[PDB]
Design a protein around this ligand. Structure first.
Ligand SMILES: Nc1nc2c(ncn2[C@@H]2O[C@H](COP(=O)(O)OP(=O)(O)OP(=O)(O)O)[C@@H](O)[C@H]2O)c(=O)[nH]1
Length: 377
Protein backbone atom coordinates (compact mmCIF):
# COMPACT_ATOMS: atom_id res chain seq x y z
CA UNK A 1 0.00 0.00 0.00
CA UNK A 2 2.94 2.28 0.66
CA UNK A 3 4.77 2.41 -2.65
CA UNK A 4 8.06 0.52 -2.27
CA UNK A 5 9.61 3.44 -4.15
CA UNK A 6 9.43 5.42 -0.91
CA UNK A 7 12.27 3.22 0.29
CA UNK A 8 14.53 4.85 -2.23
CA UNK A 9 13.36 8.38 -1.50
CA UNK A 10 13.82 7.84 2.22
CA UNK A 11 17.32 6.40 1.83
CA UNK A 12 18.19 9.33 -0.44
CA UNK A 13 17.22 12.00 2.05
CA UNK A 14 18.90 10.10 4.85
CA UNK A 15 22.16 9.63 2.94
CA UNK A 16 22.21 13.25 1.76
CA UNK A 17 21.60 14.37 5.36
CA UNK A 18 24.48 12.28 6.67
CA UNK A 19 26.84 13.55 3.99
CA UNK A 20 25.78 17.12 4.86
CA UNK A 21 26.86 16.52 8.49
CA UNK A 22 29.90 14.65 7.19
CA UNK A 23 31.14 17.58 5.08
CA UNK A 24 30.58 20.00 7.94
CA UNK A 25 32.55 17.77 10.32
CA UNK A 26 35.55 17.13 8.07
CA UNK A 27 35.57 20.86 7.21
CA UNK A 28 35.77 21.75 10.92
CA UNK A 29 38.41 19.06 11.51
CA UNK A 30 40.51 20.27 8.61
CA UNK A 31 40.58 23.78 10.20
CA UNK A 32 41.69 22.29 13.48
CA UNK A 33 44.47 20.21 11.93
CA UNK A 34 45.50 23.25 9.90
CA UNK A 35 45.62 25.44 13.00
CA UNK A 36 47.72 22.94 14.90
CA UNK A 37 50.19 22.31 12.06
CA UNK A 38 50.74 26.03 11.35
CA UNK A 39 51.05 27.00 15.05
CA UNK A 40 54.77 27.91 15.25
CA UNK A 41 55.16 27.24 18.97
CA UNK A 42 54.38 23.56 18.65
CA UNK A 43 56.60 20.71 17.48
CA UNK A 44 54.85 18.50 14.96
CA UNK A 45 51.70 17.80 16.93
CA UNK A 46 49.96 17.75 13.58
CA UNK A 47 51.78 17.34 10.31
CA UNK A 48 51.51 18.64 6.77
CA UNK A 49 50.48 15.11 5.76
CA UNK A 50 47.72 15.26 8.36
CA UNK A 51 46.62 18.52 6.75
CA UNK A 52 46.78 17.39 3.12
CA UNK A 53 44.73 14.28 4.04
CA UNK A 54 41.94 16.33 5.55
CA UNK A 55 41.86 18.82 2.69
CA UNK A 56 41.55 15.90 0.29
CA UNK A 57 38.67 14.44 2.28
CA UNK A 58 36.91 17.81 2.46
CA UNK A 59 37.12 18.14 -1.35
CA UNK A 60 36.13 14.48 -1.82
CA UNK A 61 33.01 14.70 0.35
CA UNK A 62 31.88 17.97 -1.22
CA UNK A 63 31.07 16.41 -4.56
CA UNK A 64 29.82 13.08 -3.25
CA UNK A 65 27.02 15.06 -1.65
CA UNK A 66 26.58 16.76 -4.97
CA UNK A 67 26.13 13.55 -6.94
CA UNK A 68 23.98 11.97 -4.24
CA UNK A 69 21.71 14.92 -4.88
CA UNK A 70 21.18 14.00 -8.54
CA UNK A 71 20.71 10.25 -8.05
CA UNK A 72 17.44 8.74 -9.24
CA UNK A 73 15.95 5.32 -10.17
CA UNK A 74 15.93 4.45 -13.87
CA UNK A 75 13.96 1.75 -15.70
CA UNK A 76 14.47 1.13 -19.42
CA UNK A 77 12.02 -0.58 -21.80
CA UNK A 78 12.79 -2.49 -24.99
CA UNK A 79 10.61 -4.14 -27.56
CA UNK A 80 9.79 -4.57 -31.17
CA UNK A 81 7.43 -2.07 -32.60
CA UNK A 82 4.90 -2.78 -31.57
CA UNK A 83 4.70 -4.95 -28.56
CA UNK A 84 3.52 -1.87 -26.79
CA UNK A 85 6.47 -0.50 -24.89
CA UNK A 86 4.99 3.01 -25.00
CA UNK A 87 1.59 1.77 -23.78
CA UNK A 88 3.27 -0.01 -20.87
CA UNK A 89 4.99 3.20 -19.82
CA UNK A 90 1.83 5.26 -20.30
CA UNK A 91 -0.07 2.82 -18.11
CA UNK A 92 2.48 2.86 -15.27
CA UNK A 93 2.10 6.60 -15.30
CA UNK A 94 -1.68 6.96 -15.45
CA UNK A 95 -2.08 8.86 -18.72
CA UNK A 96 -1.15 9.18 -22.38
CA UNK A 97 2.15 10.76 -21.39
CA UNK A 98 3.69 9.25 -24.51
CA UNK A 99 1.69 9.80 -27.65
CA UNK A 100 2.04 8.22 -30.19
CA UNK A 101 5.26 7.07 -31.82
CA UNK A 102 7.82 6.74 -34.38
CA UNK A 103 11.26 8.41 -34.15
CA UNK A 104 14.75 7.11 -33.71
CA UNK A 105 15.65 8.43 -30.34
CA UNK A 106 15.47 7.15 -26.79
CA UNK A 107 12.53 8.64 -25.00
CA UNK A 108 12.90 9.18 -21.29
CA UNK A 109 10.19 10.50 -19.02
CA UNK A 110 10.97 12.57 -15.93
CA UNK A 111 8.91 14.51 -13.44
CA UNK A 112 8.72 18.29 -13.28
CA UNK A 113 7.93 20.26 -10.22
CA UNK A 114 5.74 22.39 -12.39
CA UNK A 115 2.34 21.90 -13.82
CA UNK A 116 2.97 21.52 -17.55
CA UNK A 117 4.45 18.89 -19.79
CA UNK A 118 7.27 19.81 -22.15
CA UNK A 119 10.33 18.49 -23.99
CA UNK A 120 14.07 19.02 -24.11
CA UNK A 121 16.72 17.82 -26.55
CA UNK A 122 20.49 17.36 -26.41
CA UNK A 123 22.56 20.50 -25.83
CA UNK A 124 19.67 22.93 -25.39
CA UNK A 125 17.97 24.20 -22.23
CA UNK A 126 14.98 25.55 -24.12
CA UNK A 127 11.76 23.90 -22.91
CA UNK A 128 10.07 22.83 -26.14
CA UNK A 129 6.30 22.50 -26.31
CA UNK A 130 4.08 19.99 -24.47
CA UNK A 131 4.82 17.39 -27.15
CA UNK A 132 3.30 18.96 -30.19
CA UNK A 133 6.61 20.11 -31.56
CA UNK A 134 7.89 16.69 -30.95
CA UNK A 135 9.27 15.14 -34.09
CA UNK A 136 24.37 11.85 -35.37
CA UNK A 137 24.49 8.44 -33.68
CA UNK A 138 22.16 8.37 -30.68
CA UNK A 139 19.28 10.72 -30.04
CA UNK A 140 17.66 11.29 -26.65
CA UNK A 141 14.49 13.22 -26.13
CA UNK A 142 13.66 13.98 -22.51
CA UNK A 143 9.94 14.23 -21.85
CA UNK A 144 8.83 16.03 -18.67
CA UNK A 145 5.48 15.31 -17.01
CA UNK A 146 4.01 16.98 -13.87
CA UNK A 147 4.98 15.09 -10.68
CA UNK A 148 1.61 15.95 -9.09
CA UNK A 149 -0.16 13.61 -11.49
CA UNK A 150 2.11 10.50 -11.24
CA UNK A 151 3.29 9.00 -7.96
CA UNK A 152 6.12 7.24 -9.82
CA UNK A 153 7.60 10.50 -11.04
CA UNK A 154 7.15 12.21 -7.67
CA UNK A 155 9.09 9.37 -6.12
CA UNK A 156 12.27 9.86 -8.17
CA UNK A 157 11.73 7.36 -11.05
CA UNK A 158 12.85 7.97 -14.65
CA UNK A 159 11.26 5.77 -17.38
CA UNK A 160 13.04 5.28 -20.67
CA UNK A 161 11.62 4.00 -23.95
CA UNK A 162 14.01 2.72 -26.57
CA UNK A 163 13.31 2.94 -30.25
CA UNK A 164 12.04 -0.44 -31.51
CA UNK A 165 14.70 -3.11 -30.97
CA UNK A 166 13.55 -4.34 -34.34
CA UNK A 167 14.69 -1.40 -36.51
CA UNK A 168 20.09 -0.65 -35.86
CA UNK A 169 23.40 -1.00 -33.89
CA UNK A 170 24.49 -1.36 -30.18
CA UNK A 171 26.67 1.31 -28.48
CA UNK A 172 23.37 2.54 -27.18
CA UNK A 173 23.99 1.28 -23.58
CA UNK A 174 25.68 4.45 -22.41
CA UNK A 175 22.12 5.70 -22.27
CA UNK A 176 21.38 2.42 -20.49
CA UNK A 177 23.82 1.63 -17.67
CA UNK A 178 22.25 4.22 -15.33
CA UNK A 179 19.30 1.78 -15.44
CA UNK A 180 18.41 -0.30 -12.43
CA UNK A 181 15.87 -2.38 -14.32
CA UNK A 182 15.56 -3.47 -17.92
CA UNK A 183 12.14 -4.59 -19.18
CA UNK A 184 11.60 -6.63 -22.31
CA UNK A 185 8.16 -5.87 -23.67
CA UNK A 186 7.22 -8.95 -25.76
CA UNK A 187 4.37 -9.40 -28.25
CA UNK A 188 2.33 -12.25 -26.88
CA UNK A 189 0.75 -12.89 -30.22
CA UNK A 190 4.18 -13.84 -31.35
CA UNK A 191 7.19 -15.50 -29.91
CA UNK A 192 10.34 -14.30 -28.29
CA UNK A 193 12.76 -13.38 -31.11
CA UNK A 194 16.57 -13.54 -31.10
CA UNK A 195 16.76 -9.88 -32.08
CA UNK A 196 14.93 -9.23 -28.80
CA UNK A 197 17.30 -11.63 -27.02
CA UNK A 198 20.38 -10.16 -28.80
CA UNK A 199 19.99 -6.83 -27.10
CA UNK A 200 19.63 -8.28 -23.60
CA UNK A 201 22.61 -10.56 -24.24
CA UNK A 202 24.79 -7.51 -24.84
CA UNK A 203 23.41 -5.98 -21.65
CA UNK A 204 24.13 -9.11 -19.60
CA UNK A 205 27.81 -9.12 -20.56
CA UNK A 206 28.55 -5.56 -19.40
CA UNK A 207 26.43 -5.73 -16.24
CA UNK A 208 26.57 -8.25 -13.41
CA UNK A 209 23.10 -9.72 -12.74
CA UNK A 210 20.99 -6.91 -14.20
CA UNK A 211 17.36 -6.96 -13.21
CA UNK A 212 15.28 -8.07 -16.13
CA UNK A 213 11.49 -8.29 -16.52
CA UNK A 214 9.57 -9.75 -19.43
CA UNK A 215 6.19 -8.27 -20.18
CA UNK A 216 4.19 -10.33 -22.62
CA UNK A 217 1.93 -7.46 -23.56
CA UNK A 218 -1.10 -7.59 -25.88
CA UNK A 219 -2.43 -10.47 -23.78
CA UNK A 220 -5.97 -9.40 -24.93
CA UNK A 221 -5.67 -11.14 -28.27
CA UNK A 222 -5.59 -14.51 -26.47
CA UNK A 223 -8.66 -13.71 -24.38
CA UNK A 224 -12.14 -15.30 -24.53
CA UNK A 225 -10.58 -18.77 -24.26
CA UNK A 226 -10.28 -20.61 -20.90
CA UNK A 227 -8.34 -23.73 -22.00
CA UNK A 228 -6.49 -22.08 -24.87
CA UNK A 229 -5.19 -19.41 -22.55
CA UNK A 230 -3.43 -21.62 -20.09
CA UNK A 231 -1.81 -23.61 -22.87
CA UNK A 232 -0.37 -20.60 -24.69
CA UNK A 233 0.82 -19.09 -21.41
CA UNK A 234 2.65 -22.28 -20.49
CA UNK A 235 4.43 -22.13 -23.85
CA UNK A 236 5.42 -18.44 -23.47
CA UNK A 237 6.48 -19.24 -19.89
CA UNK A 238 8.82 -21.94 -21.13
CA UNK A 239 10.58 -19.68 -23.66
CA UNK A 240 10.77 -16.84 -21.15
CA UNK A 241 12.03 -19.03 -18.30
CA UNK A 242 14.58 -20.59 -20.60
CA UNK A 243 15.83 -17.22 -21.81
CA UNK A 244 16.25 -15.64 -18.38
CA UNK A 245 17.37 -18.67 -16.37
CA UNK A 246 19.54 -20.54 -18.88
CA UNK A 247 20.50 -18.31 -21.80
CA UNK A 248 21.04 -15.12 -19.84
CA UNK A 249 21.66 -17.03 -16.63
CA UNK A 250 20.62 -13.88 -14.79
CA UNK A 251 18.15 -15.36 -12.35
CA UNK A 252 17.28 -18.83 -10.96
CA UNK A 253 14.07 -20.66 -11.88
CA UNK A 254 12.07 -19.74 -8.78
CA UNK A 255 13.02 -16.08 -8.89
CA UNK A 256 12.15 -15.96 -12.63
CA UNK A 257 8.49 -16.62 -11.75
CA UNK A 258 8.43 -13.06 -10.47
CA UNK A 259 10.06 -11.62 -13.57
CA UNK A 260 7.59 -12.76 -16.24
CA UNK A 261 4.13 -11.31 -16.60
CA UNK A 262 1.18 -11.57 -18.95
CA UNK A 263 -0.38 -8.24 -19.40
CA UNK A 264 -2.64 -5.91 -21.37
CA UNK A 265 -1.21 -2.41 -21.45
CA UNK A 266 -3.98 -0.97 -23.70
CA UNK A 267 -6.59 -2.09 -21.20
CA UNK A 268 -4.73 -0.85 -18.14
CA UNK A 269 -4.15 2.56 -19.67
CA UNK A 270 -7.77 2.86 -20.80
CA UNK A 271 -8.98 1.93 -17.32
CA UNK A 272 -6.62 4.33 -15.65
CA UNK A 273 -7.16 7.39 -17.80
CA UNK A 274 -10.96 6.98 -17.49
CA UNK A 275 -10.79 8.12 -13.86
CA UNK A 276 -12.23 11.49 -14.94
CA UNK A 277 -15.15 -5.16 -19.78
CA UNK A 278 -13.59 -7.79 -22.02
CA UNK A 279 -13.11 -11.38 -20.90
CA UNK A 280 -10.83 -11.39 -17.88
CA UNK A 281 -10.14 -7.67 -17.70
CA UNK A 282 -9.92 -7.89 -13.91
CA UNK A 283 -7.47 -10.78 -13.67
CA UNK A 284 -5.11 -9.15 -16.17
CA UNK A 285 -5.34 -5.80 -14.38
CA UNK A 286 -4.52 -7.49 -11.12
CA UNK A 287 -1.57 -9.10 -12.91
CA UNK A 288 -0.27 -5.75 -14.17
CA UNK A 289 -0.64 -4.53 -10.57
CA UNK A 290 1.40 -7.44 -9.15
CA UNK A 291 4.07 -6.63 -11.71
CA UNK A 292 4.17 -3.00 -10.58
CA UNK A 293 4.49 -4.03 -6.94
CA UNK A 294 7.30 -6.47 -7.65
CA UNK A 295 8.98 -4.04 -10.03
CA UNK A 296 8.87 -1.26 -7.42
CA UNK A 297 10.27 -3.60 -4.75
CA UNK A 298 13.06 -4.66 -7.09
CA UNK A 299 14.09 -1.24 -8.45
CA UNK A 300 13.98 0.58 -5.11
CA UNK A 301 16.10 -2.08 -3.44
CA UNK A 302 18.65 -2.42 -6.21
CA UNK A 303 18.93 1.33 -6.72
CA UNK A 304 19.84 1.95 -3.08
CA UNK A 305 22.60 -0.63 -3.13
CA UNK A 306 24.24 0.34 -6.43
CA UNK A 307 23.87 4.06 -5.94
CA UNK A 308 24.43 4.47 -2.18
CA UNK A 309 26.40 1.60 -0.62
CA UNK A 310 29.90 2.32 -1.92
CA UNK A 311 29.65 5.99 -0.90
CA UNK A 312 28.57 4.72 2.51
CA UNK A 313 31.65 2.47 2.58
CA UNK A 314 33.89 5.31 1.45
CA UNK A 315 32.54 7.51 4.30
CA UNK A 316 33.30 4.78 6.87
CA UNK A 317 36.93 4.62 5.68
CA UNK A 318 37.22 8.42 5.75
CA UNK A 319 35.91 8.58 9.33
CA UNK A 320 38.46 5.90 10.28
CA UNK A 321 41.39 7.94 8.95
CA UNK A 322 40.15 11.13 10.61
CA UNK A 323 39.86 9.26 13.94
CA UNK A 324 43.49 8.03 13.48
CA UNK A 325 44.57 11.62 12.80
CA UNK A 326 42.81 13.04 15.85
CA UNK A 327 44.33 10.27 17.98
CA UNK A 328 47.74 11.09 16.52
CA UNK A 329 47.33 14.82 17.42
CA UNK A 330 46.03 13.97 20.92
CA UNK A 331 48.97 11.63 21.55
CA UNK A 332 51.73 13.81 20.11
CA UNK A 333 50.37 16.68 22.21
CA UNK A 334 50.68 14.49 25.27
CA UNK A 335 54.42 14.69 24.66
CA UNK A 336 60.13 20.21 29.71
CA UNK A 337 57.71 22.98 28.95
CA UNK A 338 56.12 25.90 30.72
CA UNK A 339 52.65 26.03 32.18
CA UNK A 340 51.73 28.47 29.41
CA UNK A 341 52.63 25.91 26.73
CA UNK A 342 51.12 23.11 28.81
CA UNK A 343 47.61 24.58 28.67
CA UNK A 344 47.92 25.24 24.93
CA UNK A 345 48.64 21.52 24.45
CA UNK A 346 45.78 20.69 26.75
CA UNK A 347 43.39 22.86 24.69
CA UNK A 348 44.47 20.91 21.61
CA UNK A 349 44.04 17.65 23.42
CA UNK A 350 40.39 18.17 24.14
CA UNK A 351 39.60 19.68 20.78
CA UNK A 352 40.92 16.51 19.17
CA UNK A 353 38.87 14.33 21.54
CA UNK A 354 35.76 16.36 20.67
CA UNK A 355 36.40 16.08 16.95
CA UNK A 356 37.09 12.36 17.45
CA UNK A 357 33.80 11.89 19.32
CA UNK A 358 31.72 13.37 16.51
CA UNK A 359 33.46 11.04 14.06
CA UNK A 360 32.22 8.18 16.22
CA UNK A 361 28.73 9.77 16.25
CA UNK A 362 28.82 9.93 12.47
CA UNK A 363 29.96 6.30 12.25
CA UNK A 364 26.96 5.43 14.42
CA UNK A 365 24.64 7.22 12.07
CA UNK A 366 26.21 5.54 9.04
CA UNK A 367 25.90 2.10 10.69
CA UNK A 368 22.40 3.10 11.58
CA UNK A 369 21.93 3.90 7.90
CA UNK A 370 23.05 0.46 6.70
CA UNK A 371 20.72 -1.30 9.15
CA UNK A 372 17.63 0.54 8.04
CA UNK A 373 18.47 0.49 4.31
CA UNK A 374 21.19 -2.14 3.59
CA UNK A 375 20.68 -5.77 4.73
CA UNK A 376 22.45 -7.98 5.34
CA UNK A 377 24.78 -5.69 7.32
N1 LIG B 1 -4.68 -5.36 -28.56
C1 LIG B 1 -3.75 -4.67 -27.92
N2 LIG B 1 -3.04 -3.70 -28.59
C2 LIG B 1 -2.10 -2.99 -27.93
C3 LIG B 1 -1.82 -3.22 -26.59
N3 LIG B 1 -0.83 -2.36 -26.23
C4 LIG B 1 -0.49 -1.61 -27.31
N4 LIG B 1 -1.28 -1.99 -28.37
C5 LIG B 1 -1.29 -1.49 -29.76
O1 LIG B 1 -0.03 -1.66 -30.39
C6 LIG B 1 0.19 -0.62 -31.32
C7 LIG B 1 1.64 -0.17 -31.12
O2 LIG B 1 1.92 0.01 -29.74
P1 LIG B 1 2.43 1.42 -29.12
O3 LIG B 1 3.95 1.50 -29.20
O4 LIG B 1 1.93 1.53 -27.70
O5 LIG B 1 1.72 2.47 -30.15
P2 LIG B 1 1.26 4.01 -29.90
O6 LIG B 1 2.39 4.93 -30.27
O7 LIG B 1 0.82 4.26 -28.48
O8 LIG B 1 0.00 4.20 -30.89
P3 LIG B 1 -1.53 4.30 -30.36
O9 LIG B 1 -1.64 3.50 -29.08
O10 LIG B 1 -2.45 3.75 -31.42
O11 LIG B 1 -1.90 5.74 -30.08
C8 LIG B 1 -0.87 0.46 -31.06
O12 LIG B 1 -1.75 0.55 -32.16
C9 LIG B 1 -1.65 -0.01 -29.85
O13 LIG B 1 -3.04 0.14 -30.04
C10 LIG B 1 -2.54 -4.20 -25.90
O14 LIG B 1 -2.33 -4.45 -24.71
N5 LIG B 1 -3.50 -4.92 -26.59
Amino acid sequence: PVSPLKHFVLAKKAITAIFDQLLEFVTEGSHFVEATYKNPELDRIATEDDLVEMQGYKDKLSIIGEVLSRRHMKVAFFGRTSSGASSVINAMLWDKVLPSGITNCFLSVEGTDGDKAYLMTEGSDEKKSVKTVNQKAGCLVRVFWPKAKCALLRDDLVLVDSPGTDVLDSWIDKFCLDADVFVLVANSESTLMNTEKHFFHKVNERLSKPNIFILNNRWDASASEPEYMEDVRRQHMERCLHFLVEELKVVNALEAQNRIFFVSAKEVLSARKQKALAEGFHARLQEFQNFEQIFEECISQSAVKTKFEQHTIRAKQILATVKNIMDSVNLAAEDARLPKEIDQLEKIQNNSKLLRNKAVQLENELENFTKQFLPSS
